[PDB]
Design a protein around this nucleic acid. Structure first.
Lengths: 177, 255, 140, 207
RNA sequence: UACCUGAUUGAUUCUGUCAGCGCGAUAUGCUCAAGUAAAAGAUUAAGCCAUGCAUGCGAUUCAUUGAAAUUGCGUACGGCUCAUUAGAGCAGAUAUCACCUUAUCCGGGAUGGAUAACUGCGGAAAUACUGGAGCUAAUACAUGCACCCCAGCGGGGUGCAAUUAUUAGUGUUGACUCUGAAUAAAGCAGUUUACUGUCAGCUGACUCUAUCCGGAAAGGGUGUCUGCCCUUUCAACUAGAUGGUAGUUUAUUGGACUACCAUGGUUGUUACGGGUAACGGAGAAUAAGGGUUCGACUCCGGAGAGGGAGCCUUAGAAACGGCUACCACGUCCAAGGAAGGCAGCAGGCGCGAAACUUAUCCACUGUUGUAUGAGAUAGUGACUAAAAAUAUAGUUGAAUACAAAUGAUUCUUCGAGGAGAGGGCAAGUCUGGUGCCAGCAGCCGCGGUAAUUCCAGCUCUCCUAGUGUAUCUCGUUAUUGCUGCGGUUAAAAAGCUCGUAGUUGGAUCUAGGUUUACCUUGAAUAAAUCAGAGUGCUCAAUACAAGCGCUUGCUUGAAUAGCAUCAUGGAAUAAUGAAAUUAAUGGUUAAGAGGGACAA
RNA sequence: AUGUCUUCAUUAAUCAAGAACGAAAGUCAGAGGUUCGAAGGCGAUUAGAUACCGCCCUAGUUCUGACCGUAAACGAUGCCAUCU
RNA sequence: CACACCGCCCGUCGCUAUCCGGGACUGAACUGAUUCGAGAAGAGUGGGGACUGUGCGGAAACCAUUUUUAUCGCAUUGGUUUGAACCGGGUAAAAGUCGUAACAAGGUAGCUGUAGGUGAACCUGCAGCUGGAUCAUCG
RNA sequence: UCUUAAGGUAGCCAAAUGCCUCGUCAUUUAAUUGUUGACGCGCAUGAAUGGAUUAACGAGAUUCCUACUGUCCCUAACUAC
RNA sequence: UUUUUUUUUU
């Protein structure tokens, strides 16, 4: 009958629940990039850990190994398209140099306020929540949505949102009536 | 069990059929016939996936009940008919002719052919024997038996079989230097020139084949299918000419 | 020293198996009488009936009377002593009550200054002891 | 019922074997035919796959073969003489493959005389009966007599066989399984085989 | 991310465990904005079950299109569960020259009599109970339409399959008592279309039905090699047991069984016995590497249908939504009799720490395709996985979707809790009560009238729609150590020696100028899962898609990686063999190994 | 052990099962029984003194033939080879 | 020993709680095997011939026997669980009784094996060990 | 504390030895002054006046289970003398 | 020559 459904975890808990250094460093990451909870930062840590581990495992191999070649260019390609790796810095010895801040910057929430669409990062988030941003003619409502390089310059207000042309919001309509 | 099995779970279906995992619990179970279950394709699947002429499995049956599909010159109305390697499928209404061939990966494709090609097919001589009344016959790998063949035809050879006249036209001999197709194993879908033959007496002989790109590969004789004399193929081949592109070469070609 | 030859796999494997039995954890997990000896029979909790309320003198250097209760388990009829945690919670437990009992935390060993008690009460009359203590729920 | 399963036996080492399942149909057995000498009686058995077997319970006529002469005649089973397996089968007149029996010699004598046009150890003082004369003293053209003259060249018959023909009962051996095919076809003993079985029979009679 | 921290002492360094700490499974406490996927009476009781469903659809149509009934086909697949089971079962390779097959593929082969529906007469309290009387059909039932011998004038026999025997050697396979060709009888019971609808023009062409023979395919039965749990408080076991001959049975081989005969067969390289809270595998959890633990459960194989046993029908069953009996336990009786098998779906009772609606449909995947509790939908659902609101949801009517719905998606009306706060370990020596009491406290320890530890208020800390507790697995753990532990005193060298199995064994044969073992490379090697390539499901977990023009279309992806067997090459290392008419005729050296001799 | 220009030529190391030896005490049988001496009995000491101290002693201590197979049977260190 | 000799500490006895062992009772219960006795039902065979087709045929009940063999009886045996008068061991538990065994030469150095004795720790004999209170004592 | 030459040791027990006594508890039975196992301040057990065990043996004393039966319920018939 | 003990927690 029905088969097993595939599920995966995207977060790994820290080995030490209480260390002041880690707690401060993670709270600062929540601060700069407006996040919701520690799971939000552990998710990025986990993705970065996967990337770094894959790079290390490939680098254990010599330069012209078939697997090394294929997987290395694939990984570098994905990172470039996300905008996390430097398009001149095409190597795994250099992909083993990234930080959680690189990934956290490419989030839609950060770009919304970085490009001026919103004042504060919290403003960016509540706009993305209330469906006032669109990407390449698509209303994205996920503050964690990553912005590819191509999508970087094609993000503006929704064509419907009252701040992008549309029926006035509830407050305005109440006042008008 | 207590008797023959009539179902075939989707996950148990052959991988090379390339069915989708979440597309129901069952898959069309081919009927017994010319081709083996693992090395065949239901006529229902041919229309459902490879040709897209039918949206669902009621529509496949609706199409096939009209008596519009011919396999090897005979009309087939059963949606579970096991079409297999080097089978001529003719849809007269749309004037379309295909030959069921293997892709380099090892999957069935849609190879459109012309009437001249469709008039014949190749078969591998599986046995040469003498039936009652002392008359010679040869049995192919697709179940066909042909009476009164040329006495020079031996096992493992290829015979050109004319669908219209139901007669043998030519015989290509399984010897070094002839073009050969690989139907089974991990080298399925590859075409090359037969090379050395390791003669294992009580087991399956081993055949080394070198393609046009210079790549060599071995296989078992039961997976080799001669498709021409020297280097000339008696039938056409799908885009690729049985050349196994490497994984890097595939990406480079795509880009 | 241990054998090191290239053909001593059997000796190494057999010796490892022989010596694994001298390990408390392995023997405790494979002895065979675990189910018949453990009062819960390998379960985490068990329902039982309260027989009486007893007081256990705390070990030294502490001094107190821990309010425990004697319980008879329904599944096998074995008698155990369970601790009633929290302050004044022995009042909630009446005689001839159906109580859910759980382990005390150390896998069948006494905890703290309470001697010989390896179980604690979780529910009484199908009501959570914590809920009763916090006032969330009341005695049925 | 009767089973042919390999389990229920001990192992090579003498260990008791585990029973894998309940008795399966495809490993069944059936009661033995135990064919006897008597009026023809053959029952039909439905076997696996819809096929059929012929369980012969009683048989009297056997379609036996003379190998040296390369012929086959239908004679009648008279009595059972020797059985390698067990003497009880001989004493109860059981027709089983490989059993030595006594069959009528007259059909073979008739064939011999009609084929070579010569007597087969005919009696030394008795005139041939009319039916014999119809095939022995028959008169046909020399064209046909040429064929018989050619065949008379190779006509010597072994003395041990002639002695049996004198008694009129021939020692034969059953070469079929009456319980499976429903017939008792066999062949006439001759040569070293005949000497062997004759010596066995005579020794057992002497004892 | 190849990691540790607290606790024995007045203090110190160790051994060593306990405790902490991370993940997962199950249960459970408290608590839960909307949505999306999705596990779910396995654990104990393969315990017991009220009631509904879960298997039905060419020939024969004098009923009213097609009912009823007779045929034929299917119900041996599918669904469930994991009790039994330790050369059983499974995994990989491999035979069947020892076998059996419906459905599907390829070759070859216008006869007669009776029975139902129907009419009618009845019995029983009671069954899907049935006896008589009168008709009537078939795709039911029956019948069936060049060589040998005698005699070369002429007579007979010779289809396929099949029994026995014999003859010569028309193909094959590594090899055939195989397949062909002949000869002889005989019985053998199978078979070589009295079918439906027909069409075209005496000549043609189809569909259907029936039907054997040979070869395939698919399925099955057995056979071989290698691997697969604990236990010596199990060391010897085995008597149809091991083998031979002849038979019997079977579809076939076989001590499968019988008659006679021989004395064999397994075992410290662990037989035999016992245990298993034991179905095997694919796989799952944890995870530097090496591993440890588990795997009832959607896929593959096996087994069972309350426990046994026996059988009918059939191509296929030792079938149980088939029958027959016994055992245990039920049901209805008018007491004469008649019945039952949820470990199918849904529900109920028991059992327990522990698990959902007596709902809608064949629209989807499939079953030969109207029928499908298989399958698909919706219900209950803090098992679980992903994404997200509490600041800077609800609600109305449409469309869409669907088999009908629901829900999402498009529009439009109004409109925050769980643990903690001495240390480990982030966070109060704030206030009030209580005075070794009540209580807390995983561990160390708090409390004896001035408690940062109890009970409260206020404040903080961690995580957060989740957060705690209990049991268990893995890490931690070099506290099972092959990698990789330790044995003077912390636990641990046998009192000592001899000795079989086991383990391990010195150097030495082409340097220069026959076997194995081992290594390399290939072959054979189901998916799902894991790794991994591609691809804006709005992201993600997932999924396997999709992306381009312009309409009559083109091009695509759905990769690749992941013991034993066979072959290829390599000839170090480690075993193993050769010799006690000509030619160099054939014995490595003699261990700062061992044994023996001789001296004093 | 040493000496050896003797001999054999890998016959070796360690060893589950298996076997010999194995202090003292102890057991069985037969002899001996000096000394010392468990147990026992006395005299002291003591709060008591079933002990230390003193006196008289039984088994034993000794020999022969059998058992037992244990010791702080200890260098609390297994054996073989090799280097510093 | 470190609360530092007014230290620490060992046994018997007494009270409470709890776990386990032995135990007369041919104890008891559950479960699996094996021998033997009986034996349902089916299937095979030999009879039989109600009934009905043409001296011939088909055939139901029934009878006899072979085989598979459930099931029931004793009997033996393996494995689990368990009652029991009484007799004992172990452990735990703030402030019981008796003594002083050990740690200093612990006031008789301590300990090992063995044997005997005694309320209890323990004492004594024999032979060992230093883990001793001597690394030593003059030839 | 009185006191003896010594104050009954190891064992065993309501025994063929215990008055009280049909001791008390358990076992056997529906029911037991009986049996067996325990307890022991034992009127008045006890170590070659030998103590405690003990396989095999017994026309020895005792209790129970099974088989069997006219011993009995409850008697009847038959034969020889 | 004789020379036994020292409640619980802190």
């Amino acid at each position: 009958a029905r088969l097993k459904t595939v599920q995966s975890k995207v977060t790994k808990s820290p080995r030490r629940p209480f260390e002041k250094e880690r707690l401060d460093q993670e709270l600062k990451l929540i601060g700069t990039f407006g996040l919701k909870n520690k799971r939000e930062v552990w998710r990025v840590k986990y993705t970065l850990a996967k990337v770094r581990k894959a790079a290390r495992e490939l680098l254990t191999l010599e330069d012209k190994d078939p697997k090394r070649l294929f997987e290395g260019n694939a990984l570098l390609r994905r990172l470039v398209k996300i905008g996390v790796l430097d398009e001149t810095k095409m190597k795994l010895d250099y992909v083993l140099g990234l930080k959680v801040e690189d990934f956290l910057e490419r989030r839609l929430q950060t770009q919304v306020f970085k490009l001026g669409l919103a004042k504060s990062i919290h403003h960016a988030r509540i706009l993305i929540k209330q469906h006032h941003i669109r990407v390449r003619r698509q209303v994205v409502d996920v503050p964690s949505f990553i912005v590819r390089l191509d999508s970087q310059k094609h993000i503006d207000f929704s064509l419907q949102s009252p701040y992008g042309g549309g029926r006035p919001g509830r407050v305005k309509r109440r006042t008008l009536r | 069990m207590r008797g023959p099995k009539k179902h075939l779970k989707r996950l148990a279906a052959p991988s090379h059929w390339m069915l989708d995992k979440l597309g129901g619990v069952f898959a069309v179970r081919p009927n017994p016939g010319p081709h083996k279950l693992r090395e065949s394709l239901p006529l229902s699947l041919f229309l459902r996936n490879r040709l897209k002429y039918a949206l669902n499995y009621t529509e496949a049956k609706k199409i096939l009940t009209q008596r519009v599909v011919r396999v090897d010159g005979k009309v087939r109305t059963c949606h579970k008919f096991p079409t297999g390697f080097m089978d001529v499928v003719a849809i007269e209404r749309t004037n379309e002719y295909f030959r069921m061939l293997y892709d380099t990966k090892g999957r069935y494709v849609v190879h459109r052919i012309q009437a001249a090609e469709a008039d014949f097919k190749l078969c591998k001589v599986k046995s040469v024997r003498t039936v009652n009344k002392g008359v010679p016959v040869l049995t192919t790998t697709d179940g066909r038996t042909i009476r009164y063949p040329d006495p020079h035809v031996k096992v493992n050879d290829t015979i050109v079989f004319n669908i219209s006249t139901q007669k043998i036209t030519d015989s290509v001999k399984f010897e070094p230097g002839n073009l050969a197709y690989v139907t089974g194993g991990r080298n399925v879908g590859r075409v090359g020139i037969i090379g050395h033959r390791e003669r294992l007496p009580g087991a399956s002989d081993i055949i080394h084949i070198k393609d046009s790109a210079g790549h060599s590969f071995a296989t078992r004789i039961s997976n080799v299918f001669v498709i021409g004399k020297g280097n000339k193929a008696l039938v056409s081949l799908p885009t690729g000419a049985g050349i196994r592109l490497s994984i890097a070469e595939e990406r480079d070609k795509r880009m | 020293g241990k054998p090191k030859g290239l053909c001593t796999a059997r000796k190494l494997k057999t010796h490892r198996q022989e010596q694994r039995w001298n390990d408390k954890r392995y023997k405790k997990a494979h002895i065979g009488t675990r189910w018949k000896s453990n009062p819960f029979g390998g379960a985490s909790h068990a329902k039982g009936i309260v027989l009486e309320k007893i007081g256990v003198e705390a070990k030294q250097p502490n001094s107190a009377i821990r309010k425990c209760v004697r319980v008879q388990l329904i599944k096998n009829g074995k008698k155990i002593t369970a601790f009633v945690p929290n302050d004044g919670c022995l009042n909630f437990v009446e005689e001839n009550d159906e109580v859910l009992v759980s382990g005390f935390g150390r896998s069948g060993h006494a905890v703290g200054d309470i001697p010989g008690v390896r179980f604690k009460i979780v529910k009484v009359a199908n009501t959570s002891l914590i809920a009763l203590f916090k006032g969330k729920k009341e005695r049925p | 019922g009767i089973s042919r399963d390999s389990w229920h036996k001990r192992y090579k080492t003498g260990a008791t074997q585990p029973v894998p399942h309940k008795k399966r149909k495809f490993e069944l057995g059936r009661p033995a035919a135990n064919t006897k000498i008597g009026a023809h009686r053959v029952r039909l058995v439905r076997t696996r796959g819809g096929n059929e077997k012929y369980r012969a319970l009683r048989l009297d006529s056997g379609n036996f073969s003379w190998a040296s002469e390369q012929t086959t005649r239908k004679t009648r089973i008279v009595d059972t003489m020797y059985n390698a397996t067990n003497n009880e089968l001989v004493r109860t007149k059981t027709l089983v493959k490989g059993a030595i029996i006594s069959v009528d010699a007259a059909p073979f004598r008739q064939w011999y005389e009609a084929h070579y046009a010569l007597p087969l150890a005919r009696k030394k003082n008795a005139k041939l009966s009319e039916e014999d004369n119809a095939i022995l003293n028959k008169k046909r053209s020399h064209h046909t007599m040429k064929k018989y003259t050619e065949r008379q060249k190779t006509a010597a018959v072994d003395a041990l066989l002639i002695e049996q023909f004198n008694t009129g009962r021939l020692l034969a051996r059953i070469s079929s399984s009456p319980g499976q095919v429903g017939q008792a076809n066999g062949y006439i003993l001759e040569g070293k085989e005949l000497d062997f079985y004759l010596r066995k029979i005579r020794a057992k009679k002497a004892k």
